[PDB]
Amino acid sequence: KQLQKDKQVYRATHRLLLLGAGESGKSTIVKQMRILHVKATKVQDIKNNLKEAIETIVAAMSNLVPPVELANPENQFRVDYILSVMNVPDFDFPPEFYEHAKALWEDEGVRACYERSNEYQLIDCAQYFLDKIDVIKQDDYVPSDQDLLRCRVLTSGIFETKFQVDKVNFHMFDVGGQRDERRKWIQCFNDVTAIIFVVASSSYNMVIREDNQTNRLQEALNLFKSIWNNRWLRTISVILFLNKQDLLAEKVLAGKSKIEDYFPEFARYTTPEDATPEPGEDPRVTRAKYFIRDEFLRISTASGDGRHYCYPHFTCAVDTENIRRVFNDCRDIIQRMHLRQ
Amino acid sequence: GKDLEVEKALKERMIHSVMPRIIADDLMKQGDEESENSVKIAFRPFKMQQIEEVSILFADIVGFTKMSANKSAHALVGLLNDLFGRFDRLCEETKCEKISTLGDCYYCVAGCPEPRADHAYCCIEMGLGMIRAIEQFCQEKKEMVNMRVGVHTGTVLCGILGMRRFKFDVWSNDVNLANLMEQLGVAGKVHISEATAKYLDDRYEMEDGKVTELKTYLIAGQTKIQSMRDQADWLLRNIIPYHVAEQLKVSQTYSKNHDSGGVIFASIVNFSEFYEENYEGGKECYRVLNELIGDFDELLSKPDYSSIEKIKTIGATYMAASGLNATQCRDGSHPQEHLQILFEFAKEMMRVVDDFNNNMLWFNFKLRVGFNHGPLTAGVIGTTKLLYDIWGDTVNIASRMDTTGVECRIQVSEESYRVLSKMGYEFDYRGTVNVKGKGQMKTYLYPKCTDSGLVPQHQLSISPDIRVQVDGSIGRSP
């Protein structure tokens, strides 16, 4: 009849819905899966990310509450050139723009404005791409795999990716996570195997793009409490990725931002006894990351009645080896979760 | 023994009266046992299929109010049986599946369960046949009526939503477009668009169909038995109420004239801005809408909403009427207590959409309802099919109270205010709304000052009442 075979192979797949708030790393995980298990517009929107980063820093110079001034005040014509191209639909990216961008990024008042980037909305690939389009000022360079992982394109709508690891079928749903995109989530809640919830862990000092008055990690906590206590997800377990571990590591080792100034229970928090830290890891970073993990596990423990579970992992989406390890672990987990029906 | 196949014949006739023949015979080879276990955990089950290349006809009787004026509510139902039986004979000639029949509106599709290569021809030739049949009816019965027909093609996701009073319907934006091109049509001509005309191949009498107020045209011509018994009894109490089934047990047709019965409509306002077809046709969106309609249907199983009847659901609208079963005025009961409990049904379905939006994340469905009572006319349309429906001016004014309302509030007409205010409910004067037949009409709203500082808005006198989606207003106000 040909529909019994299709029905049984539809029973055989694993639907992996990816949720989470905005800019948390969902599409980067999807790109990493198709690196593991599966051409000029990529160059174009990488250049768009470059331009967006440099113009955001240049505008946020004056727009801070103490305006950080230029260490070399001779580049004011370059600042005015960057502010002149701040709003234009098409842009051919002349070599003059590359010279002005590099001469901005060599200046140190520019970098001092860059260090206070939690007070304005700035993208999570500026530091990499300023140097890497210093590399590709020219045109005959193809981007590497890391360059493709670092590019930021705002997901809007339901995207699907079918990949097959060791004769097991996977079908994962990349969804956007901006606050106006969240009404589209319930379209994917039917017969999904597991939910991979992705959290930007290092965004404890940042605020969301919608109202600029709500913490990003508090937004992720409220969103996790919403999708955990939902009436159509009350038998579906949530694998909890905590993304951007290296950014959390460098923001704790920098010592500028304090978690207790934003989440005040961190000062009276002690690291758990069952902590399994990585080789060569400063335990202040370990205390921080287990604090964020236990902040989510409080939500997943307060209710749920033993019908569905939560399996927190620590992950870094731009590192392929970390994703290979955590996806092997999650592969065994969702094998059990699909057998749970 | 033999009464088992008698019950199976009755169950067959009640399946075929609500579902098309292909899907009914699919149900009679007992295909999905999980649906067969449902007739006996995250989402409720529902069946919809996103189907392309169909042709959707609506058709509305022009001049139904004066034609039904001096009728004794048996003559009306009888002549309406006559006209709709002529339409059904036209359907089974022209191979177009009819869908339903609400009010003075009749509407078909052209090969949605079975793909048909000449569906547009079938649809517009069925419309031309309707014009012929209504002029023959006007000559014979001496009733001055005709009808306007609108035909649009496209893609349609069709199936069943709800679980009380459920029925095979169609839903898309193409169904909404066929609805509005019925609304923008002239009487006596079938109103077709570019989506039909691009493969109509022009063997007809086409005109530039222009509006007086988008490449649109006009054509004018040229113990097993206990299981089977309870299953068939559930399918019977599905399609008609109980007292009509008892009065139809000893007779051939049903027609009843009620003197005081309330009626609500309930339109979900912002379902259009949730719909978007960018994923797989948007049938997941209708799974969500099925969940909300099923919650409203679970309100009907309460022991204190026993005498609340549900007529049907029309797109996102939800029609319910009361006071139809209460033939005996009790010794210790209020004479208009059915109005009180139907108003409580409206309040509790407001509460149900509030409880539903907690599980909806960063979106809120809102619904307005509209309330009226008065005399009305119940009846059953088909024979070998069945269709319970009510008519009257009361139902038209209740549809007007739905359409001219503000969301998240219960709008109540003037005589319904005068009876509900003596039962202790508090209302605030909304203003005065134009009602066809009544003129300027005094209306009210139920939650006292649920806005901050603006209760009144009395400037609304809009003549152009054109709805761009399928609502409860279709089959109402010809």
Ligand SMILES: Nc1nc2c(ncn2[C@@H]2O[C@H](COP(=O)(O)OP(=O)(O)OP(O)(O)=S)[C@@H](O)[C@H]2O)c(=O)[nH]1
């Ligand atoms: N350093 C570092 N950057 C990351 C990591 N994961 C994602 N990013 C960066 O974050 C940015 C946004 O990631 P992205 O995958 O687009 O999030 P998203 O969930 O898809 O964003 P949206 O769809 O909700 S709008 C990208 O520039 C990407 O480079 C990570 O693990 N480490």
Ligand SMILES: [Mg+2]
């Ligand atoms: Mg994305």
